[PDB]
């Protein structure tokens, strides 16, 4: 129950993909962006909190993350804001996990698939909702069930 979300971004094909990984669950909500601008960025963040319960943002250095309009955004949206990776073991362990899932799953679809959003969309329900311990939780699952401990 922290919705510590860290955001980074990576690279497929040559698809720009923006990474956000929920680090209690190792939930994963990813967007193809065109460019590598705190514009997109502040879309996917806004996107993000749309969906989800995000009380901490961390992220590395890179302008992208750390420009006036996106402090000024999490700052509106109550969201603690931090930089530096590793925030801690802990959690950079998850997200690196979760991009290499991200990257496997993404691969299974890729040869199903025109478009690289399209692939990202069905690898996500793959790792988030599909995957999971045998009669255990999945990401969702884990996520969900601290969701609901906070929303009663």
């Not at 979300?5 to 065109?34: C, F, R, Y």
């Not at 420009?67 to 801690?88: D, M, Q, S, V």
């Amino acid at each position: 129950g922290s919705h510590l979300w860290q955001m980074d971004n990576t690279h497929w094909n040559k698809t720009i993909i923006w990474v956000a990984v929920e680090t209690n669950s190792g939930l994963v909500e990813a967007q193809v962006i065109p460019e590598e601008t705190a514009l997109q960025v502040a879309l996917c963040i806004l996107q993000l909190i749309q969906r989800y319960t995000v009380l901490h943002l961390h992220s590395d250095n890179g302008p992208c993350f750390t420009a006036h309009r996106i402090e000024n955004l999490c700052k509106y949206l109550g969201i603690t804001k931090t930089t530096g990776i590793p925030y801690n073991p802990q959690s950079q362990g998850v997200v690196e996990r979760a991009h290499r899932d991200l990257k496997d799953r993404l691969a299974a679809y890729q040869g199903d698939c025109e478009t690289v959003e399209a692939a990202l969309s069905l690898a996500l329900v793959s790792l988030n909702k599909k995957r999971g311990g045998i009669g255990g939780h999945t990401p969702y699952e884990i996520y969900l069930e601290s969701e609901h401990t906070k929303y009663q």
